[PDB]
């Protein structure tokens, strides 16, 4: 029973980063070689594990988080980073155990006139904790005047659209990102390599 990685990486549609998707992966054999032999990824790095050893390891829980961000924001999907993605949308732990995988999706996620379906959070009263998700749409109080859900001066709707356009430079183009987290919790293993 092979793990449903084709579902995660080859899905027609990806989530916005503020509403990033989580898929639990369990009770299956994980052929990471379909990934670590492929040459389609612009980013493929792991923390606490080596990419060539994943086929020899067993884990209690495996989660696949996926979303779309700009190419020049992929750097923020790393331990210790700051910026609107790391602070307000998707936060990796400082001691992250897992892998970060990304690839250019300009051919799929850009549109003439701009694809406005992909959103990110621009304002928040505090930084996200690791693996936290915030899907609220409350008006952000940037000044001394309470907003009371009314959008206006100093009172901002907290989400903004990327507006991906196909003629953008590579840094401004959309990138699809999958974060694999490998969890050990003193229980039997559910996900193992093809051994």
């Amino acid at each position, epitope marked *: 029973n092979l793990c449903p990685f084709g579902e995660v990486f080859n899905a027609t549609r990806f989530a916005s980063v503020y509403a990033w998707n989580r898929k639990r992966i369990s009770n299956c054999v994980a052929d990471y070689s379909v990934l*670590y032999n492929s040459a389609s*990824f612009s*980013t*493929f*790095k*792991c*923390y*606490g*594990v*080596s*990419p*060539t050893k994943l086929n020899d390891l067993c884990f209690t829980n495996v989660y696949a988080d996926s979303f779309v961000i700009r190419g020049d924001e992929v*750097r923020q999907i*790393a*331990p*210790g*980073q*700051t910026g609107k993605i790391a602070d307000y949308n998707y936060k990796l732990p*400082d*001691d*992250f*155990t897992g*892998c*970060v995988i990304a690839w250019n999706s300009n051919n799929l996620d850009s549109k003439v006139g701009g694809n406005y379906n992909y959103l990110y959070r621009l304002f928040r009263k505090s930084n996200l904790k690791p693996f936290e998700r915030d899907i609220s749409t409350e008006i952000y109080q940037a000044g001394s005047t309470p907003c009371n859900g009314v959008e206006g001066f100093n009172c901002y709707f907290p989400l903004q659209s990327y507006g991906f356009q196909p003629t953008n430079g590579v840094g401004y183009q959309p990138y699809r990102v999958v974060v694999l987290s490998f969890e050990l919790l003193h229980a039997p293993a559910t996900v193992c390599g093809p051994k």
Partner: nanobody, 125 residues
Framework: PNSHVQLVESGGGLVQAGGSLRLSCAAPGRTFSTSAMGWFRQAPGKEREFVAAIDWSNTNIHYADTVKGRFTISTDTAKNTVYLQMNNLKPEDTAVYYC???????????????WGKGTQVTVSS
């Protein structure tokens, strides 16, 4: 220069060929204990090249072929410092040596997240 993660190298200097020298890199290993630590070097007119890599558990050690049997990478137990012990130094080892923190890459040993400032090593014949 403004990131929370900062890496500071020290120990560079002038050494005679055949001598030894140990570089140090202060690093936030207690906090970022799962990241890969590595050393790079860049000589004048050449591209930066990989030298060595290690995790904070003193395992998963990688070496470039040019330094195998001469260089040794290691960490301290409190996860505060990475080291590059250099033995039987040659003139070709002259370069600015950089410390780096990142993740274990698929196409290369380390996909770097953070860079140090570098320390100058000069080997004279």
């Amino acid at each position: 220069p403004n990131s929370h993660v900062q890496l500071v190298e020290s120990g560079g200097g002038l050494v005679q060929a055949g001598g030894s020298l140990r570089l140090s890199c202060a690093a936030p290993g207690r906090t970022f204990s799962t990241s890969a630590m590595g050393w790079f070097r860049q000589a004048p007119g050449k591209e930066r090249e990989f030298v060595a890599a290690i995790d904070w558990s003193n395992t998963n050690i990688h070496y470039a072929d040019t330094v195998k049997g001469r260089f040794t990478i290691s960490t301290d137990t409190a996860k505060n410092t990475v080291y590059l012990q250099m033995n039987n130094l040659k003139p070709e080892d002259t370069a600015v040596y950089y410390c780096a923190q990142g993740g274990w890459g698929l196409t290369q040993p380390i996909s770097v997240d953070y860079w140090g400032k570098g320390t100058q090593v000069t080997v004279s014949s």
